[PDB]
Amino acid sequence: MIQRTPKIQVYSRHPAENGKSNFLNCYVSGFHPSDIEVDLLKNGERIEKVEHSDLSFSKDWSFYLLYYTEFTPTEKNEYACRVNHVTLSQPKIVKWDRDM
Amino acid sequence: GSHSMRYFFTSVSRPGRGEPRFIAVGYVDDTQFVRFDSDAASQRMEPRAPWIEQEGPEYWDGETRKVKAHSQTHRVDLGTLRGYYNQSEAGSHTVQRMYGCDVGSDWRFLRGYHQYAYDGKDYIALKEDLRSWTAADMAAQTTKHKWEAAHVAEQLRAYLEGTCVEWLRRYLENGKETLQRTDAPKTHMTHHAVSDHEATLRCWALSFYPAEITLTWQRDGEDQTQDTELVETRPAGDGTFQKWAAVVVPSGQEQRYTCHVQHEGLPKPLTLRWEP
Amino acid sequence: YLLMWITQV
Ligand SMILES: [Cl-]
Ligand SMILES: [Cl-]
Ligand SMILES: [Cl-]
């Protein structure tokens, strides 16, 4: 029973452009075991038609998933990824920074 | 160059909450092409790349049949493992398996493999000679003795050297337009002042395939594998990949730093320069 | 193309 904390990246599929549709991505990798809660947030609220990749894993056996939803960024809206996992003492919220 | 076929399986027990979850995914190089999920509704091996949609009914019936037999072996394997380790049958446990073959440039067998994990740790693996096993602990020794007596490596070896490679090839021909492509990275650099005497310089690689890539920063031509920050490569979600490497530099010294990008899809490696 | 069968651990 190893237990590994999830790493998280929040990004978009194409370079972001206000008013132009895109995909908001949340990539969780590095974690074990596989039960994991991920939501994408618009202004603090969970988005509803969020899809995800099939569970797969790396050479060290740790897991990875891509969660993603279609969206149109605008300057008034903040987006995040909220991930809960048995290795976390509380949900981790990672804000989307456009100009990483 | 070289190419791979790989299936990954994850099987998780769920006592008190339903039957074990099983998920199977196949890949060729960095492209997924099939999957099965016990919780999904089709209950069929499903295509996830366009070239595999070419295949007819005999094929999908057969892959579905086999993935269900895999599922069933794993369902039994969770029971045995819990017995081997004298584990209370009231806990969620995880089995993982990966097997596959690689071929070189000439599309001929290079290498095979078959790894197995229990609760996130090596349990048993076929060694590179395709002939013997590495067992991580006494439970795995029991599996090894059994598998030795039943001459399992041999059956596995015939697959890895035969069928695996013959279908890898088939998939590569049929899916030539995508699998044998390279998407060269689109690249660029951003500048970010953090204080009166520092700036974060970031190198960006976008829209590339396959995933393999190296982004490195050099000062005056000398490598800086010491103080760059590198992110793990991530999927774009469209079948391509992305990565950045950042370096925090003293103000006024930007023109001295350069980013170099090695990717299979580039004629020669890229030097990106801070030229005003 | 999967293995035709897998053997119990
Ligand atoms: Cl939207
Ligand atoms: Cl892979
Ligand atoms: Cl789910």
Residue numbers in the entry:
A (entry chain B): 0 to 99
B (entry chain A): 1 to 276
C (entry chain m): 1 to 9
The authors write:
The MHCI is assembled in the endoplasmic reticulum and thereafter transported to the extracellular side of the cell membrane, to which MHCI is anchored by a short transmembrane domain.
The asymmetric unit contains 14 MHCI moieties, arranged in two juxtaposed heptameric rings, a previously unreported packing for MHCI crystal structures, containing 69% solvent content. The 14 MHCI76 pI molecules in the asymmetric unit show negligible structural differences, and the average root mean square deviation was 0.29 Å/374 Cα atoms between MHCI complexes. The D76N mutation site is localized in the β2m E-F loop, a region far from the heavy chain contact interface; accordingly, no major structural effects induced by the D76N mutation are observed at the heavy/light chain interface region. Overall, the crystal structure of MHCI76 pI does not appear to be affected by the D76N mutation; globally and locally, it matches closely the three-dimensional structures of WT MHCI pI. Furthermore, it is worth noting that residue 76 is not involved in any crystal contact with symmetry-related molecules within the crystal packing. Our data show that the association within the MHCI has a remarkable stabilizing effect on the D76N β2m variant.
